[PDB]
């Protein structure tokens, strides 16, 4: 079958229940060429997931949906079996392999649920080619309505909350935030942006480049210095990887800290998220459900010596590379979605009206 990826290094005892992999290690080294048990599109997608060639939640969801469309196109139903059951049964090991390559994001989980529900609803008497075409069209429509139109609506909503001469603080990389800022600048607003970044990913630089290419004045700093710059900040705009049923925001680590420091300086905190990233699950802390990235990424060359090199020689040393954190609802002033401007407490309400 598909072998189990081996855990790398020693994990912190409080995080011992979560997997922790190595970027260099790949599952495909034990799998056959050409791939048989796993579809080649799945193999390639998992390879770029484990190596970090695609990182954004929207980007990961779109790549997964395109690969799933390819798999559906290449699929053939076997004799004496049904599409709605056999396709799901065949897709399950692919999802297991993808999870082994890298834990699935909330957007990926919601997309998988949507596609499973859509496949299960395929009629028994429906023809194979028509069902495949309808599944491809459904995936395309899902991508369109849940990403593009949602981002356009969110940008239109957020334009109303941006005034001339204000200072907006952003964190990390978020396509929604960059789109909002670019369109607000294009429509005629004049302002400046403060970009906050964190190690080891340093993805905020991405956003910085975008801003520089849009003519928007920008400032750059690391997260520990955020408290220095918040006195001059008028509002804080943050992207969300997921919104949980209790109103808490699951996002890149350091978002809750930024929200707390912004609250200490009496500036509003605005969160922009698409409704397809809303999750039914609840979570009170970053320990129960999280992702453990490669600890070797924490090594930095300061001067001429790397202190964390060969860190596993010391038995008692542990390296923690957390990916996500949770912001409590009390630290968020406003959530901007395609439905409108709502508080965090309205997150379950949306979950109630999107389902039915």
């Amino acid at each position: 079958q598909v072998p189990t990826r081996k855990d790398y290094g020693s994990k912190v005892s409080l995080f011992s229940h979560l997997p922790q992999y190595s970027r260099q290690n790949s599952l495909t080294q034990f799998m056959s060429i050409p791939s048989s048990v796993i579809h080649p599109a799945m193999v390639r997608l998992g390879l770029q997931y484990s190596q970090g060639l695609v990182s954004g939640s929207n980007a990961r969801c779109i790549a997964l949906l395109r690969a799933l469309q390819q798999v559906i196109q290449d699929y053939t139903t076997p004799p004496n079996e049904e599409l709605s059951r056999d396709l799901v049964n065949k897709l399950k090991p692919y999802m297991s392999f993808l999870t082994q390559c890298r834990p699935l994001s909330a957007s990926m989980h919601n997309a998988i649920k949507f596609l499973n529900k859509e496949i299960t609803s395929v009629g028994s008497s429906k023809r194979e080619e028509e069902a495949k075409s309808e599944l491809r069209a459904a995936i395309d429509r899902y991508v369109q309505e849940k990403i593009v139109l949602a981002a356009q609506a969110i940008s239109r909503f957020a334009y109303q909350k941006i005034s001339n001469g204000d200072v907006i603080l952003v964190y990390g990389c978020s396509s929604l935030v960059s789109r909002i800022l670019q369109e607000a600048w294009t429509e005629g607003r004049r302002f400046r942006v403060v970009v906050v970044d964190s190690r080891p990913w340093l993805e905020g630089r991405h956003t910085l480049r975008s801003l520089v290419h849009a003519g928007v004045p920008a400032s750059y700093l690391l997260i520990p210095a955020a408290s220095y710059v918040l006195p001059e900040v008028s509002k804080v705009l943050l992207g969300a990887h997921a919104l949980l049923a209790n109103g808490s925001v699951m996002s890149r680590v350091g978002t809750a800290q930024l929200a707390l420091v912004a609250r200490a300086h009496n500036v509003p905190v605005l969160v922009c998220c698409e409704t397809y990233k809303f999750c039914e699950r609840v979570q009170t802390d970053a320990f129960v459900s999280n992702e453990l990235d490669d600890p070797d990424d924490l090594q930095c060359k300061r001067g001429e010596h790397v202190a964390l090199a060969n860190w596993q020689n010391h038995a008692s040393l542990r390296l923690l590379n957390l990916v996500y954190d949770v912001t409590p609802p009390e630290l968020v002033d406003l959530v901007i979605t395609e439905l409108g401007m709502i508080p965090c407490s309205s997150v379950p309400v949306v979950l109630r009206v999107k389902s039915s």
Binding site: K161, P268, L334, G340, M341, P343, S346, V353
Partner: protein
């Protein structure tokens, strides 16, 4: 219907029944405008109603008037969604508007009957300024054979606090008048704070007279419950981020003296509306349920 007769009808219905609030008068004027419009298209109907709402909000700079305007526009939009033919839609609209007026006329007594049970015997009630809904809830509480002492703030720019004190002494309720600056001095003697609201914003906060935020912050500092009694038709889809984010059409004309302030939902314990006793988080849900 001319603009002049619109303003005249608004002012006449405001003056004839001082008990009835400004939002109810505005909604009544809009329904009377819809009564005799001699039109044939719903598009011009919506445009004319919107212009009537702008001129009415020109007459009065209160948040409740604009609340009623948006609520009435949504009512017309829903009615049009129900029926495509203009005549059937219009008759449905007039019957629905009469029922809506009947239901919003009696919201005050529902709020009173649902809120008077939160007053205890021997309690000390603090309130900000004149609000007919608070007068009604206190009257119902007295009719429940309950004895309590009410404190009120003089509400300096227009002494509506003195008017509240007179209208409360009318029924021989023991009341006291304190300055705007004495609020922080009085919080520890009171048991709970009950205020009204000229507008209930999306996140559950309220817009009210300029002294409400001070009382909310003081009550939070002294762990006192803060109750807001407000009508359903005061539900604006506004999201103020701070005091500066409040629209300027409501602050002034109603050195620099704003007439209203915004109170965050985290400073409010419960909202007593004709919908019931609600947490602030419910209010947003309502609005989300209204606009699809």
């Amino acid at each position: 219907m001319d603009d002049k007769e619109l303003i005249e009808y608004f002012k006449s219905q405001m003056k004839e029944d001082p008990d009835m609030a400004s939002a109810v008068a505005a909604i009544r004027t809009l329904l009377e405008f819809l009564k005799r419009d001699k039109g044939e298209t719903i598009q011009g109907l919506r445009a004319n109603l919107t212009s009537a709402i702008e001129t009415l909000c020109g007459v009065d700079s209160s948040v409740a008037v604009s609340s009623g305007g948006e609520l009435f526009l949504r009512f017309i939009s829903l009615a049009s969604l129900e029926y495509s033919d203009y005549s059937k839609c219009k008759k449905i609209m007039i019957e629905r508007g009469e029922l809506f007026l009947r239901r919003i006329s009696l919201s005050r007594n529902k709020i009173a009957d649902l809120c008077h049970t939160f007053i205890k015997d021997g309690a000390t009630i603090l309130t900000h300024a004149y609000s007919r809904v608070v007068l009604r809830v206190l009257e119902a509480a007295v009719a429940a054979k309950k004895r309590f002492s009410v404190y009120v703030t003089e509400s300096q720019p227009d002494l509506s606090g003195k008017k509240m004190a007179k209208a409360l002494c009318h029924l021989n309720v023991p009341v006291t008048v304190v300055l705007d600056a004495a609020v922080g001095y009085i919080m520890e003697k009171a048991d709970l704070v009950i205020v009204g609201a000229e507008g209930v914003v999306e996140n559950g906060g309220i817009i009210n007279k300029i002294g409400t935020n001070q009382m909310a912050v003081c009550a939070k500092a002294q762990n006192k419950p803060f109750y807001v009694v407000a009508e359903s038709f005061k539900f604006v889809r506004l999201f103020p981020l701070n005091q500066q984010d409040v629209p300027d059409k409501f602050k002034y004309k109603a050195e620099e003296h704003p007439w209203v302030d915004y109170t965050a939902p985290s400073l409010i314990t419960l909202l007593f509306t004709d919908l019931g006793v609600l947490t602030p988080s419910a209010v947003s849900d309502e609005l989300i349920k209204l606009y699809l």
